[PDB]
Design a protein around this ligand. Structure first.
Ligand SMILES: [Ca+2]
Ligand SMILES: [Ca+2]
Ligand SMILES: [Ca+2]
Lengths: 35, 47, 47, 35, 47, 35
């Protein structure tokens, strides 16, 4: 029997992905600045 | 010469700033998703 | 001519960056409010 | 009778408003960059 | 003259943008820590 | 006897410190822009 569980893992996982997308874009910006 | 180098450097800054603005938008969207997660914790507690 | 265009483009970038910095500050303040919401959930649970 | 309820809606609503303020400022910055 | 002033102003913008990018990174890391706090609230509730 | 308590104060405190670090860096950027 499945018990009721709190799972906000979808929204937290979407936040984690967006913060990784931001990291890659910041690295690209900083690449451009150094050059 | 110096005006050409300065044009090139302006192009560089513009590309960087455009990229920086996309990074910011990604963080802004991460924030919207974090607000939804905290709303989900509140709803689970009130039930 | 090219030095005048470059001055104008520098003014453009400066205005954009000032605006970008205000956007960042708004996200920083959103983050402070999210921290207060999570603190409020913790306090409700410990009571 | 009012029952005790968790309500962090004030702080979450303030965060939502600030993230909308940020969106408008980013749009203004990107307007300026395109021009 | 104007090309020298424009070089100087470009250096100014570059320094500002580099600094702005570090501010953004700090907010991005704050966001990672907020995600960990919300995960900790969820784990406490599921236990 | 210690009772079990929810404490996410470490992660929240780390977030608070990072948002203060961001504020100081934004102030430095805005200093540079005004000058
Ligand atoms: Ca990705
Ligand atoms: Ca508004
Ligand atoms: Ca510090």
């Amino acid at each position: 029997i499945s018990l009721e569980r709190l799972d906000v893992g979808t929204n937290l996982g979407n936040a984690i992905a967006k913060l990784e997308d931001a990291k890659e874009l910041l690295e690209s910006s900083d690449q451009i600045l150094r050059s | 010469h110096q005006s050409m180098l300065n044009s090139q450097a302006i192009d560089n800054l513009r590309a960087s700033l455009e990229t920086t603005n996309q990074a910011i938008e990604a963080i802004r969207q991460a924030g919207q998703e974090m607000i939804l997660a905290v709303q989900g914790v509140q709803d689970y507690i009130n039930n």
